[model samples]
Target: PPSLRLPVIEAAFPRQLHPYWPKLQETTRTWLLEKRLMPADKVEEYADGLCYTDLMAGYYLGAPDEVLQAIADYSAWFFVWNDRHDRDIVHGRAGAWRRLRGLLHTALDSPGDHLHHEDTLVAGFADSVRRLYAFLPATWNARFARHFHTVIEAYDREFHNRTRGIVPGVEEYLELRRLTFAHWIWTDLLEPSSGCELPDAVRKHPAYRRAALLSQEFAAWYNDLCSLPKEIAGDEVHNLGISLITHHSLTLEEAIGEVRRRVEECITEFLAVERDALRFADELADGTVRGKELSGAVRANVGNMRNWFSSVYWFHHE
Candidate 1:
């Protein structure tokens, strides 16, 4: 069964090492060990648990040198969030509020670069959560909504701190971030509602199609959450809250079965879309299109979405 599991490492890093030195070295070592390309002793010396984070950092750092600095700066913020989540239980930083707040402050004072829009996007998503709770049954709303808002406040503060005296072009970044959050809410909240229908305004947006596809990814994530307790029994933090929510919302058996079905569906949809996006990128890179750079950027972004979904799925299975 372990052998049959999906190969997430390969999916995350299909090429040479990422640009970040430490991450690149770790990822390289991981691949060497897994593929038996290096001696056991040598591989063990380089292997580290932070391989994934390193790989991600490297990938972002490897972006064009013109953008590399910005990407690295943004990566730092992301890393802080990742680190917060990894030690959430020990540190009692339940919902990543502190890291997010730090990010908001940085954003509000810093240049309009890197992830300048993240703060506004996070704020909008928080607002949407509030709106959803007002209209939906209390039982359907997330119990951790307060924690989520606290995290958003952190994001907002960082954004303001970073861009306080910034000139034009900042609004576009803010709007894009808002759109990103809206897209997530559409996928994670609206699409998963069992007895409810989405409002017309949201339903008509072109982004809804992308959101629908992402819903499948979220469903897969839910499946992974369900499977985590069984796969990693020794782990202390076992998503008990998610398990309880699912059990209360639907029969346990039904919930598990739904997750299984959705994971399968997500895999099928993701593969097809990923292939198309990649093909488009190849065509653009070959100089067949005038807007190839833009197309390539979009392709890379979608690839990231697919990578996260696949990585989450594989991590749980392992």
Candidate 2:
């Protein structure tokens, strides 16, 4: 089981550590406290963990304070929401996720009908979605929304496997992870955070999508490697590392090496696509409004991905 873990990982990308880490940390701390996201009894234990203001600062690196804070707030809420989803809804409660899913869908899909006061964490997440929608173009907003929906559906799948005592094979695990992990929702959020929304044509292009997906998978693999220990401690089997260990009968150390290779391979694939994509970005930058926007989007897309590698690399390290 330990073999599926990466006791050490290299984010390997150039460092893009953000200057706003400290302030963002404080902001999230205060925000969490003000929101009372944790009950009084649990505040002391969960507060520091929720202060992932540092985590978002690292991920976002050079973003403005306002943007950095906005995302950091969401990062705090996400972990809390993530843990609750996995621990309570996904693993603990059976036959209840359908209702919870319906509530979440209603909140995001029809905000005016929101029962946010009944659930502050969901409300905070919805607030982030609303704020992003307010500024981002409709296309970008819709793209982000689509990714969230897919992730939600994937969680339901995970719930079925978990509650029903089914352990998916390697291919099935990877397929589910396509939506269940880092690369799906967070990768798409780069659009709003970077002020660059690639047109669906470009974003969905075979080459570009493959490249983007490689990086996303890289992040998820790296995360699974790092989180292996925690997951194992809890008997959590729904992870890439765990899947590899079970499917291939690899030693813990061997699985570490395999997952490490997986992480590195993703970077190579990402760079392969980036080389041509960046060059193509110049070709698309001809004199016109659409050209300028798309060009900027492509350029920003490249930078944001590199930051993603560097940031998560650091998060894993810490």
Candidate 3:
């Protein structure tokens, strides 16, 4: 039976804006819409999708600041590691390491340096996993982290290779990278945090149950979107539109349409989840579910999730 007490440590941090997140989202949406890369209807859809993604980001970040920092740090470190490995593979031994060092320096100095902090956590986590690997030698736990790290490496290699030396596309690529990071973090972090192993008081809480379900659903939907490009182009990194576009699978226009459709689907699905959770809360209030006052951690998680939907909608409109 899962413990009922909220994991106080995990819930210490609250959801708050990263200062530049809103502006970045707005700017990106405007750029897409103005360039006619995204249609009006599709703009709305992407905005909603962005909101959902943002909310998930917030939820993850809302975990104790240290946890959030850990996530960011590890992600950044692995990003740099992957970049270095790829550069070495394609260019030369020292050539790749030099470029990797320069990129790290640039990343550390950039205005968006917080990403580096967050990524450090990822590196720490990876280090811990590596230690476990060294000790256990043959356990699946050791393999899991390695696999996760490899996935990021593969994704970066494919994406960077496809784009070559592009500028405008770097931000877009970063967005995709962030999405991949968040996806893995959600699966690797939150699901286990809320599993049946936790105390019943915590696992049975509306927030925990909701997080569990949302994590599962979100992963399924995201995987479906990712797999689409592979099906259509015999590849994933180069076919963003193909991944989202569902109708009339071949044409570029249709692919774009599918992207819009998927974005809308994401928004609708998230909204439905929120609504259902709210209803559950109401029931809890009426004593239909046995629980005490909903913890701040749970509230923050739910609030951030809702806020994400709103943000995405706004982004679409802009």
Candidate 4:
């Protein structure tokens, strides 16, 4: 095989590891095996290969220790869930996907009832969501649950494509990829990580949405580049590089070059919209104390986005 040339994208903020990351890592690894999320025989290989805990620690740098544990559990569950889809559902153990989807939706809808489920994956997610509800505001819980649902549904769509051997067109892939990437769920985490919920109006502001989408694109496109080789080896078709190669008749190098270009554009636009979000926060700050508090949370959420990119990029490279 010819040596592959990797693309470069730098994070703008200094990296910080959460003080609780070690405990978070230890707890999740234990839970993973205890729950049989991964087969016991393969658990050590999974843990050593991905370092998924490090990625979560970097993504949620400022989360309180309790929230950090919650996020870590959720992150671990997500990684295993995605891997299982690629391994089982895509390869013809198909009905489990539908069965697990219904159970997971029930878990998110009524976390209190999580213990009633027989499946360990459903139980694991329910436990993690329950912890999140305990620590974050009810509003954040609602948004997070909704986004989580969206991600699961999007994965179902991707699963169908993979099983049928259909590669989505560029536009369709971009739309679905954003949701499947789980960037929205990660951004929703910024609230608990910052210890305050963003004001609803501020969160819905056009500028904020623009910046969030760009951040998603930047991270997702960069990941496509980094993971393309392995994905190709596995004969996966959902990746951006795979789509480009299929639709454009481009060679592997050409596909990678196009993916890199999009990532660069996303960061440039992300920086611009980030400024707009900050300025909007300033405008939203009225003289009243309550307004000031709300505005401060908005600013902190923006700052967290900056930190997330740096840590995630570093994790990808590592």
Cα TM-score per model: 0.42, 0.86, 0.42, 0.90
For every model shown, the clashing-pair count is 19, 1, 34, 0
Candidate 4 error regions (>4 Å) = 1-11, 40-42, 45-49, 233-236
Prediction 3 global C-alpha lDDT: 0.41
Model 3 lDDT tens row, 92-132 = 45454544444443442232433323344333333433332
Residue range 1-318, candidate 2, lDDT tens digits: 344333333434666667877777777677767776767545445446544455566565456677777777766766766676777544567555676666666666755455354677666667666655664678776777777887778878887777665667878988898887746566676666667666678777766677678767877887777876567522245877677777788767777787778887777777788777787777788999888888877767666766677667666555
Off by over 4 Å in 1: 1-47, 54-62, 65-79, 82-227, 230-256, 275-289, 300-318
Identify the superior model by lDDT, candidate 1 or candidate 3: 3
lDDT against the true structure, each candidate = 0.41, 0.68, 0.41, 0.77
lDDT of 4 at 76: 81
TM-score of 2: 0.86
Which residue segments of model 2 deviate by more than 4 Å?
1-12, 40-51, 61-64, 89-91, 233-236
Return the candidate ranking by lDDT, descending.
4, 2, 3, 1
Deviation of model 2 at 248, angstroms: 2.7
List, residue by residue over 125-235, the lDDT tens digit for candidate 4: 787788888866687889888998998899888888888778888788999998888878888887888787777777889988787777667778877888777775323
Model 2: C-alpha RMSD to truth? Answer: 3.3
Q: In what order do the candidates fall by TM-score, top score first?
A: 4, 2, 3, 1
